[PDB]
Amino acid sequence: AAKKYTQAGDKVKAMKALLRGGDAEKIIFFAGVSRQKDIYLMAANYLQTLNWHSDPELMKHIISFYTKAAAWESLASFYEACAQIEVDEYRDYEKALQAMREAAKYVAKSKNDDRDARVGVINDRIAVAEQFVAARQLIGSNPQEALRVCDELLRAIPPNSQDLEAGIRIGDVYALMVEYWYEARNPNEAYKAIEAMRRRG
């Protein structure tokens, strides 16, 4: 779509139907080249809905869009989202905890009322973050802490609250769940890797 859109596919309405959900990253690129405010906001809001385990440059790049747009609320939203789904294979939650600290800092920097919904995500995510950092700092020594953190996360979204309103998202509730099965209390469990791969697939 955007490939043929850069080939004179026209504008404004070119990306109003490309928000949706998924794991796309070039909605950034057309927001940057189109220089339209609405495309900027939708591209920056879109990346909260992604689910990956890598590429944390969107931290600073949505920081750029929300310096150009002066809305740190969804910046803190993506802080939470990307720090949550970053530690999936980053294997370090200290940076993610610093990113939740930056989420609180930018909510304090925020001025719109969207920061209230951002705190509605924060009160569920930072509550698990101090026990998920105990799930990640002690992922080599404390399997039960990480297992029960992931279990109470998995038993919070089936209630009426959404994934934003129940805890941290299920990027690392799964990814750490695989991790302590093969790493913690049994690093030499080769058939857990084919459990880990069969739970991966």
Automatic annotation (TrEMBL):
This is Uncharacterized protein. Coiled coil: none annotated. Residues 73-198 form the IF140 C-terminal TPR domain. The chain holds residues 1154 to 1354 of 1409 of the full protein. It is found in: Cell projection, Cilium. Signal peptide: none annotated. Transmembrane segments: none annotated. The lineage of its organism: Eukaryota, Viridiplantae, Chlorophyta, core chlorophytes, Chlorophyceae. It comes from Chlamydomonas reinhardtii.
